[PDB]
Amino acid sequence: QLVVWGTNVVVSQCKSKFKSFIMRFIDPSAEQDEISENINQPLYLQKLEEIHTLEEPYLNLNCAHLKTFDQDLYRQLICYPQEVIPGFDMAINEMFFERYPAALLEHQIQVFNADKTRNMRSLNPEDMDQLISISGMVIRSSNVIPEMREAFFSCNICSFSTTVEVDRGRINQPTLCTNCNTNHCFRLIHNRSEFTDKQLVKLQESPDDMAAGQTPHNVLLYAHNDLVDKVQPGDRVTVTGIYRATPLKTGGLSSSVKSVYKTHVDVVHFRKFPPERVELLQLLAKKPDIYDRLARAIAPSIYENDDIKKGILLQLFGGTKKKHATLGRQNFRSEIHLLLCGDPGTSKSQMLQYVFNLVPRSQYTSGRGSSAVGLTAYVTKDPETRQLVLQTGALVLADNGVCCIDEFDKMNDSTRSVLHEVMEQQTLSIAKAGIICQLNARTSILAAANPAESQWNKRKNIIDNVQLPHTLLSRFDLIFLVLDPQDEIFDKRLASHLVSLYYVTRHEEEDTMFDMSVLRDYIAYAREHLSPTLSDEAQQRLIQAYVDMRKVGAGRGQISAYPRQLESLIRLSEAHAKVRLSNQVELLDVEEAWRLHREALKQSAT
Amino acid sequence: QAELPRGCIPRAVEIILRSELVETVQAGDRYDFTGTLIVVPDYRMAFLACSVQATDLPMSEVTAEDMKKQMTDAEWHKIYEMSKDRNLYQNLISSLFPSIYGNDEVKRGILLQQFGGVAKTTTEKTSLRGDINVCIVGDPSTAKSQFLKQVSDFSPRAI
Amino acid sequence: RVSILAAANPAFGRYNPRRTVEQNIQLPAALLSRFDLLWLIQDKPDRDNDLRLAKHITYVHSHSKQPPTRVKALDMNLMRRYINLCKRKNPTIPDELTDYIVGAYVELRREARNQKDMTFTSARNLLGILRLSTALARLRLSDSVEKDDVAEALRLLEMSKDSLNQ
DNA sequence: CGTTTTATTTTTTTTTTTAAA
Ligand SMILES: Nc1ncnc2c1ncn2[C@@H]1O[C@H](COP(=O)(O)OP(=O)(O)OP(=O)(O)O)[C@@H](O)[C@H]1O
Ligand SMILES: Nc1ncnc2c1ncn2[C@@H]1O[C@H](COP(=O)(O)OP(=O)(O)OP(=O)(O)O)[C@@H](O)[C@H]1O
């Protein structure tokens, strides 16, 4: 019973209880509770192997394992948590010697991850010094601001060059520093000392549980000295932390103080390869069903013109560059972009929403709701002295992500013409009176293009329909059609399938097996240690067939190709080689181009 | 710009310098600064430095010979074969954009744009001038911006 | 998350019968497709029609409460509360509808195509005719989406149309 | 056992926005 006067907490209890818990530890998930799971030693001892042998410091660790153990530890950790957490670090810093006594025991650890929240909208006096974790989407990308910890002194006679660190804010003054004979008066200087880093960026909560017609309400907090630009800013992320408060300087004439207290959260943590299962990796490549099988997975319920799931073939087994290590010239980036054209309310958002609901780099857009110039970080008025900064653009924070765009022929001429270069150049020359540079960003594009009309007018080859010329309307490889089959035949099918999606009350695990995650990992392996080349085999095809590509150009109101889409073809070459097991070029791949292209390119009848 | 990250921008940082280092700086150059980071006694951060390392002594294709100056153009002995043999022009049509093909008129014409103009000795009543106004058009999908981008590597202040 | 109410007037004129739909109207299809129901309201000269409506109006002019002795009036409170008991049924649409309704939908798509100067259709036409019926069972309060549940759906859909030529 | 406290206004350039036969 040795305790702060105003509390009920003690070091030894929690220390011993947790050291027994980690001795009551074999991975209690994978060796006590999930015995059907298995990695059989206390994982933290295992880590003191797989940390020390890894030599890879600053562990990360939760504490939700502790529900089985005595919950009083849970509580007094919940409520008094800046005064027990170092004790659990001390237990770890003791565990060092369980597995290596005579190590280089000079480094420390970093570190929760267990408790709940619902939302930020409304909290209470009770919820003042307690553990919380909440999530949303990030807004900003800050700079650093350090923070002091100690005073380094000076002297006048005989070098009374004293020193001393800070509790948090005071140094004392008798007539000299650490009163040493007072040959002179007190001394201080403030630089040769200890400093500490941080930042500040805020979050926008973005769940599906956002109350009705309500605005953004948003939160923010600093960092600590290792938690500092962990962060490609702006995405769906959770934090843990400890609700903090602070009084405020009333007015500013003098030391008066406010009644109201501002709040933020303490600064801790954030939230986001296997040799074991090699078998199926090769198993799926050598299976010719890649054309459709995973494509069959993507739309979970929808066949909606499943030649578009073969258009989803276009898209993943990840996308190789022909970067230019030999000559160094020209920066030939292997970019990819296609659209999903309109004139019928088809799934030209729903797929884009399926994607954004899945990929974290998640944004949805369209004409007339926002500006073309949302790469600005506007200085309408700032918390500065008009040191006008355009901190970070918005539409470009999708680093190899996606922004979904809808209703594309919606905006003015300046909009959507301004982007005639970034597509295959990823440069944004900031040549304004303010600060200047040539920046970099490149990513993926998809939208729901629309002509001047609702329905494609018949009798009338496609180059006439959209109001772009036969250079810009005929630009890409193919910008793909979306029609109604003119009959009831197709119509009733997905009705009959998915009329009862309410009423099915089940899902069928067919031979087109709904891969829970066995899909999601192979693609992550899909780019690592084989490297698609291009030798002498699969290139002469449209070397020669450029005859066939362009000699349809003799014609107005018909259309041939132009020499950026051949680039799009050599970029098509990259994907299929490794998977199906020749990382050197095979010839069939160009057929996929003809399988794609002349589906609406030699549909040039007149 | 030799260092350039994804996502992030060439953020700004601020600095002072001494008398002999002062007003000896011009547009976009590559110098070697000193890493003496220092505090603001407001705090916020700053930094400081004391040393920089940004054609009489000669350019590449040389070793030391004599000229109007020390080695300003000294290496006539090796230049001059490539000075007068007027088919050298074809090197300047061929041996300069070998990775590229278009018309052969631009690739025989740009050079004097890069090179000095008139710079004569006449009036105060009015200036005479050397360089010329210039253009290039066509339509895209014809490789009409490779070249401009390359100049930034080729030539100075090819912004 | 807002339900949307669109109400407008015809173009130059009052539904000039020569100037047809989107001939007399100037609205892009993109918004009509987003709208479940489009409704034109015109009532030409009817000798008997405006009478009843007149005396009906004047009733609350000589008086303050219009409808006597045909129903028990429902106050704002009682109306809202009775509606308050409705929406949480999530009713049952038995499986025979799924095959049946997909057939009935085709009945539309044929008589849409048999005239060539007619309306286009979105998947929301079928999604809508689906969407409406199960709602009304909330006010049936029996979890029993059945035949009448969609026969009124189609009935009211048909009444939405086939009203301007005759 | 005495002798002292405390205020700022108009113009720029960007990104927004808005006008007539
Ligand atoms: N075969 C199909 N399977 C599933 N859904 C379909 C199919 N055909 C059409 N749909 C539906 O039709 C809707 C089309 O409208 P959406 O809101 O995407 O329109 P849009 O593409 O923005 O329209 P537009 O591009 O013409 O403005 C989608 O929500 C989708 O659910
Ligand atoms: N004579 C040539 N030499 C080299 N490349 C060529 C030649 N003719 C055509 N090409 C190729 O054709 C492609 C044309 O598309 P490109 O990327 O040049 O658009 P762009 O000219 O940059 O458009 P803009 O100049 O309007 O920005 C080029 O990438 C280029 O490599």
> DSSP per residue over C37-95, as a string?
----------TTHHHHHHHHHHHHHHSS----SSS----HHHHHHHHHTTTT------T
| Closest-approaching ligand to the CA atom of A308 | 1
> Distance (Å, rounded) from C-alpha A356 to C-alpha A365?
11
User: What dihedral angle (degrees, nearest 10) is formed by the CA atoms of C8, C11, C17, C21?
Assistant: -70
> Distance (Å, rounded) from C-alpha B77 to C-alpha B80?
6
Which of these, A136, A157, A163, A154, lies nearest to A236 by C-alpha position? A136
Strands A444-446 and A402-406: parallel
Quick one: DSSP state of residue A464? G
Of C1, C98, C122, the CB nearest to A345: C122
Q: Considering only residues 445 to 474 of chain A, which have any Cβ-Cβ distance to chain B shorter than 8 Å?
A: 471
- Give the total residue count for chain B: 159
Interface test with A, best of C26, C31, C120 (most A CBs within 10 A): C120
Distance CA A434 to C1' D18 in A: 27
Structure tokens at B82: 């490539």
Q: Which atom of ligand 2 is nearest to the CA of B144?
A: 21
Which of these, A76, A61, A70, lies nearest to A130 by C-alpha position? A76
User: What dihedral angle (degrees, nearest 10) is formed by the CA atoms of A120, A126, A128, A132?
Assistant: -50
The residues that bridge with A265 in the sheet, in sequence order, are: A243
At C17, is the secondary structure helix, strand, or coil? coil
Cα distances from B97 to residues A567, B61, B90, B142, in angstroms, run 20, 20, 11, 16
C-alpha triplet C2, C8, C14: angle, nearest 5°: 165
Which of these, B119, B143, B117, lies nearest to B132 by C-alpha position? B117
Cα distances from A325 to residues A322, A530, A582, B4, B97, in angstroms, run 9, 17, 22, 18, 18
Identify how many contiguous H helices and E strands chain A contains and give both numbers.
14, 13
Across the beta sheet with A402-406, what order do the strands follow? A362-366, A402-406, A444-446
> Distance (Å, rounded) from C-alpha A579 to C-alpha A287?
9
Question: Is A344 touching C (CB cutoff 8 A)?
Answer: yes
Q: Do chains C and A touch (3 or more CB pairs under 8 A)?
A: yes
> Distance (Å, rounded) from C-alpha A566 to C-alpha A88?
61
Measured from the Cβ of residue B13, the count of other Cβ atoms closer than 10 Å reads 10
Q: Are A376 and A337 in contact (CB under 8 A)?
A: no
Phi, psi dihedrals of residue A325, rounded to the nearest 5°:
-60, -15
The DSSP annotation for A342-355 comes to -SS--SSSHHHHHH
> Distance (Å, rounded) from C-alpha A205 to C-alpha A218?
6
Quick one: DSSP state of residue A158? S
Structure tokens at C103: 């057939």
Closest chain A CA to residue C33: A345
Please return the burial class of A585, using the count of CB atoms within 10 Å of its CB with bins 0-12, 13-18 and 19+.
buried
Quick one: DSSP state of residue B87? T
Per-residue buried b or exposed e for A14-30, using 16+ beta carbons within 10 Å of the residue's own CB: bbebbbebbeebbbbee
Which nucleotides in chain D lie closer than 7 A to a protein CB? Answer: 6, 13-16
- Quick one: CA dihedral C68, C72, C78, C80, positive or negative? negative
Closest chain C CA to residue A491: C106
At A195, is the secondary structure helix, strand, or coil? strand
> Distance (Å, rounded) from C-alpha A161 to C-alpha C58?
101
Quick one: DSSP state of residue B91? H
Which of these, C136, A342, A144, lies nearest to B43 by C-alpha position? A144
Residues of A in contact with B38 (CB under 8 A): 191
User: What dihedral angle (degrees, nearest 10) is formed by the CA atoms of C99, C104, C109, C110?
Assistant: 110
Which of these, A565, A566, A560, lies nearest to A604 by C-alpha position? A560
Closest chain C CA to residue A450: C30
H or E stretch including A520? helix A518-522
Q: Which atom of ligand 1 is nearest to the CA of C124?
A: 12
Q: Are A195 and A214 in contact (CB under 8 A)?
A: no
Closest chain A CA to residue B146: A330
CA distance A164 to chain B (A): 19
> Distance (Å, rounded) from C-alpha A416 to C-alpha A422?
11
Phi, psi dihedrals of residue B45, rounded to the nearest 5°:
-95, 165
Neighboring chains of C (3 or more beta-carbon pairs < 8 A): A
> Distance (Å, rounded) from C-alpha B1 to C-alpha B28?
10
Q: Are A532 and A577 in contact (CB under 8 A)?
A: yes
Q: Are A239 and A204 in contact (CB under 8 A)?
A: no
Question: Is B159 touching A (CB cutoff 8 A)?
Answer: no
Q: Are A428 and A441 in contact (CB under 8 A)?
A: yes
Q: Which amino acid, one-letter code, is at A422? A: V
Q: Are A10 and A29 in contact (CB under 8 A)?
A: no
User: What dihedral angle (degrees, nearest 10) is formed by the CA atoms of C20, C23, C28, C29?
Assistant: 30
The DSSP annotation for A109-121 comes to -----------SS
Residues of C in contact with A486 (CB under 8 A): 113
Residues sharing a CB contact under 8 Å with residue A398, sequence separation 6 or more, in sequence order: A361, A363, A443, A444
The residues that bridge with A151 in the sheet, in sequence order, are: A164
Q: Are A409 and A450 in contact (CB under 8 A)?
A: yes
Per-residue buried b or exposed e for C80-103, using 16+ beta carbons within 10 Å of the residue's own CB: eeeeeeeeebebbbeeebbeebbe
Q: Considering only residues 95 to 154 of chain C, which have any Cβ-Cβ distance to chain A shorter than 8 Å?
A: 95, 97-99, 101-103, 105-106, 109-110, 113, 120-124, 126, 130, 134
> Distance (Å, rounded) from C-alpha A484 to C-alpha A486?
6
> Distance (Å, rounded) from C-alpha A407 to C-alpha A346?
12
The DSSP annotation for A237-280 comes to EEEEEEEEEE----SSSSS---SS-EEEE---EEE----TTHHH
Quick one: DSSP state of residue A30? I
Phi, psi dihedrals of residue B90, rounded to the nearest 5°:
-65, -25
> Distance (Å, rounded) from C-alpha A49 to C-alpha A302?
49
> Distance (Å, rounded) from C-alpha A569 to C-alpha A539?
10
Which resolution in angstroms does this entry have?
Answer: 4.5
| Closest-approaching ligand to the CA atom of A501 | 1
Measured from the Cβ of residue A292, the count of other Cβ atoms closer than 10 Å reads 15
Residue where the block lists tokens 């916020």: B44
User: What dihedral angle (degrees, nearest 10) is formed by the CA atoms of A170, A171, A174, A180?
Assistant: 160
Structure tokens at A231: 């962060």
At A20, is the secondary structure helix, strand, or coil? helix
Q: Considering only residues 486 to 525 of chain A, which have any Cβ-Cβ distance to chain C shorter than 8 Å?
A: 486-488, 491-492, 495-496, 499-500, 502-503
Q: Are A120 and A134 in contact (CB under 8 A)?
A: yes
Residues of A in contact with C99 (CB under 8 A): 496
Q: Are A434 and A390 in contact (CB under 8 A)?
A: yes
The residues that bridge with A237 in the sheet, in sequence order, are: A136
At A564, is the secondary structure helix, strand, or coil? coil
Q: Which amino acid, one-letter code, is at C48? A: D
- Quick one: CA dihedral B62, B63, B68, B70, positive or negative? positive
Structure tokens at A24: 């009551």
Which of these, A337, A330, A590, A289, lies nearest to A442 by C-alpha position? A337
Contact A145/B45, CB-based, under 8 Å?
yes
Quick one: DSSP state of residue A28? I
Q: Which amino acid, one-letter code, is at A99? A: R
Cα distances from A502 to residues A350, A490, B21, C148, C151, in angstroms, run 18, 21, 76, 19, 19
At B136, is the secondary structure helix, strand, or coil? coil
Structure tokens at A328: 């160094």
Residue where the block lists tokens 């490549």: A285
H or E stretch including A46? helix A43-50
> Distance (Å, rounded) from C-alpha A435 to C-alpha A427?
16
Residues sharing a CB contact under 8 Å with residue A18, sequence separation 6 or more, in sequence order: A66, A69, A73, A87, A88, A91
> Distance (Å, rounded) from C-alpha A473 to C-alpha A327?
34
Please return the burial class of C13, using the count of CB atoms within 10 Å of its CB with bins 0-12, 13-18 and 19+.
exposed
Q: Do chains B and C touch (3 or more CB pairs under 8 A)?
A: no
Closest chain C CA to residue A304: C123
Cα distances from A228 to residues A201, A264, B65, in angstroms, run 11, 17, 56
Distance CA C12 to C1' D21 in A: 23
Quick one: DSSP state of residue A385? S
> Distance (Å, rounded) from C-alpha B134 to C-alpha B115?
14
Q: Are A215 and A148 in contact (CB under 8 A)?
A: no
Structure tokens at A389: 């900064």
Interface test with C, best of A503, A504, A505, A506 (most C CBs within 10 A): A503
Residue where the block lists tokens 């972009």: A337
Structure tokens at C108: 């539309």
Cα distances from A58 to residues A25, A47, A85, A228, B132, in angstroms, run 21, 11, 15, 14, 62
Quick one: DSSP state of residue A444? E
Structure tokens at A286: 């050598």
Structure tokens at C81: 């509360």
At A126, is the secondary structure helix, strand, or coil? helix
Residues sharing a CB contact under 8 Å with residue C104, sequence separation 6 or more, in sequence order: C154
> Distance (Å, rounded) from C-alpha A110 to C-alpha A223?
13
> Distance (Å, rounded) from C-alpha A504 to C-alpha C93?
10
Q: Are A70 and A16 in contact (CB under 8 A)?
A: no
The DSSP annotation for C122-153 comes to -HHHHHHHHHHHHHHHHHHTSS---HHHHHHH
Q: Are A486 and C92 in contact (CB under 8 A)?
A: no
Method used to solve the structure: cryo-EM
The DSSP annotation for B62-75 comes to ------SSSSSSTT
Going by CA atoms, what residue is nearest to atom 2 of ligand 1? A304
Quick one: DSSP state of residue A476? S
CA distance C93 to chain A (A): 7
Phi, psi dihedrals of residue A163, rounded to the nearest 5°:
-160, 155
CA distance C113 to chain A (A): 8
Q: Which amino acid, one-letter code, is at A499? A: V
Q: Considering only residues 67 to 106 of chain B, which have any Cβ-Cβ distance to chain A shorter than 8 Å?
A: 99
Question: Is A432 touching B (CB cutoff 8 A)?
Answer: no
At A83, is the secondary structure helix, strand, or coil? coil
Which of these, A94, A75, A82, lies nearest to A15 by C-alpha position? A94
Q: Which amino acid, one-letter code, is at A358? A: L
The residues that bridge with A219 in the sheet, in sequence order, are: A203
Residues sharing a CB contact under 8 Å with residue A49, sequence separation 6 or more, in sequence order: A99
Cα distances from A385 to residues A202, A382, A470, A521, A571, in angstroms, run 21, 8, 51, 50, 48
Which of these, A433, A368, A428, lies nearest to A394 by C-alpha position? A428
Q: Are A410 and A450 in contact (CB under 8 A)?
A: yes
- C113 among annotated binding-site residues: no
> Distance (Å, rounded) from C-alpha A404 to C-alpha A362?
8
Question: Is B45 touching A (CB cutoff 8 A)?
Answer: yes
Q: Which amino acid, one-letter code, is at A584? A: Q
Question: Is A240 touching C (CB cutoff 8 A)?
Answer: no
Residue where the block lists tokens 């729903």: A350
Angle between helices A11-23 and A71-79 (to 10 degrees): 130
Greatest Cα pair distance, chain B, in angstroms, is 67
Question: Is A439 touching B (CB cutoff 8 A)?
Answer: yes
C-alpha triplet A511, A513, A517: angle, nearest 5°: 160
Q: Which amino acid, one-letter code, is at A362? A: S
Contact C95/A487, CB-based, under 8 Å?
no
Distance CA A375 to C1' D16 in A: 16
Q: Which amino acid, one-letter code, is at A56? A: E
- B143 among annotated binding-site residues: yes
Residues sharing a CB contact under 8 Å with residue A296, sequence separation 6 or more, in sequence order: A306, A309, A512
Q: Are C113 and C64 in contact (CB under 8 A)?
A: no
The DSSP annotation for A565-589 comes to HHHHHHHHTTTTTTTTT-SSPPSTH
Contact A454/C99, CB-based, under 8 Å?
no
> Distance (Å, rounded) from C-alpha A496 to C-alpha C144?
20
